[PDB]
Amino acid sequence: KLSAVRIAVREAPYRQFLGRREPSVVQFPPWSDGKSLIVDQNEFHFDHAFPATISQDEMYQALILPLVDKLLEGFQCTALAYGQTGTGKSYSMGMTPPGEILPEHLGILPRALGDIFERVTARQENNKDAIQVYASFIEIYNEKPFDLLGSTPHMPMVAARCQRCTCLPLHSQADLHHILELGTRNRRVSSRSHAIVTIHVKSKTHHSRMNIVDLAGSEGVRRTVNINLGLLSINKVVMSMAAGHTVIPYRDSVLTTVLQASLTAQSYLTFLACISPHQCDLSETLSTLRFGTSAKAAA
Numbered sequence: 001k002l003s004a005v006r007i008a009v010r011e012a013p014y015r016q017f018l019g020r021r022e023p024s025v026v027q028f029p030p031w032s033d034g035k036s037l038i039v040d041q042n043e044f045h046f047d048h049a050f051p052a053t054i055s056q057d058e059m060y061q062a063l064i065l066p067l068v069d070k071l072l073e074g075f076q077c078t079a080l081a082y083g084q085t086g087t088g089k090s091y092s093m094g095m096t097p098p099g100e101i102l103p104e105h106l107g108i109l110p111r112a113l114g115d116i117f118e119r120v121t122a123r124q125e126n127n128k129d130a131i132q133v134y135a136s137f138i139e140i141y142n143e144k145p146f147d148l149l150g151s152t153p154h155m156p157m158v159a160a161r162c163q164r165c166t167c168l169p170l171h172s173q174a175d176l177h178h179i180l181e182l183g184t185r186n187r188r189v190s191s192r193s194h195a196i197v198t199i200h201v202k203s204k205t206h207h208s209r210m211n212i213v214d215l216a217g218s219e220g221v222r223r224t225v226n227i228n229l230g231l232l233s234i235n236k237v238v239m240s241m242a243a244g245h246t247v248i249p250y251r252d253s254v255l256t257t258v259l260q261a262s263l264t265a266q267s268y269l270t271f272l273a274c275i276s277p278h279q280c281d282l283s284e285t286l287s288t289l290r291f292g293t294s295a296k297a298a299a
């Protein structure tokens, strides 16, 4: 069983057009209490309903900071962003080289690394068992994993090598930029792909990890088990290992295969659904909000 599965939704900013910025199709009622949102007369209830006005910092301290504590205690954690293309999934997870953006725009990734490094260094006040931080960067393109940090980022990995990909040591949270830069210049991107940057925290006898998952939004237009294979697999997993058991379908997809060591008992899984405020994307927003409902239900 998974220690906890949380669902969060973040409304994308409304792009003004010729100075005019129309109202969002997404609504947050006075009783939302930071957990519910109304769309198309449908009110969805989640653990976190963030309006486009929320800042990176506020979204991080509420949604991720908690997980950092769990990671340092030794638990496996995973934060996954999914949703329609252009809704700020990449922006929110912080997949772009930090030194290239402004502080108030930094995403989860660098913010989490700052807290991890701060608390780990906080253990120097009482220098005890040595600790080491690592980072791995994996890309998924056409149901095939690619180690963007190795010397063969062009060669598709195997089911075994996946949980063995290269882990580069991090002495300072500032080493992040390097890792992200190298990975970007090694990725394949069909022309759309998923990314997984895992922050590893290891001791002489323990290995905990925090997976930052940045799913790509579908490419093109859709016709007027019908979405991301990975998404379906995670729910199928959570549900499976959530009553009986006995063979968890980690092999149903590369995503659940790569995150197999994290999608275990007492681990943590958090979804961050990104939706568009535009009306022309209603069909997409509802589909995205409904999956999250399924995910929640899977318990």
Ligand SMILES: Nc1ncnc2c1ncn2[C@@H]1O[C@H](COP(=O)(O)OP(=O)(O)NP(=O)(O)O)[C@@H](O)[C@H]1O
Pocket: 012, 013, 052, 083, 084, 085, 086, 087, 088, 089, 090, 091, 092, 215, 216, 217, 218, 274
């Ligand atoms: N809250 C925000 N504040 C300021 N800019 C934002 C915000 N959210 C989204 N953007 C901008 O919107 C653009 C797209 O963000 P992005 O994360 O790449 O969408 P995306 O979901 O990753 N697209 P895709 O990879 O095809 O699914 C970038 O310029 C972001 O900086």
Ligand SMILES: [Mg+2]
Pocket: 089, 090, 091, 214, 215, 216, 217
């Ligand atoms: Mg992206």
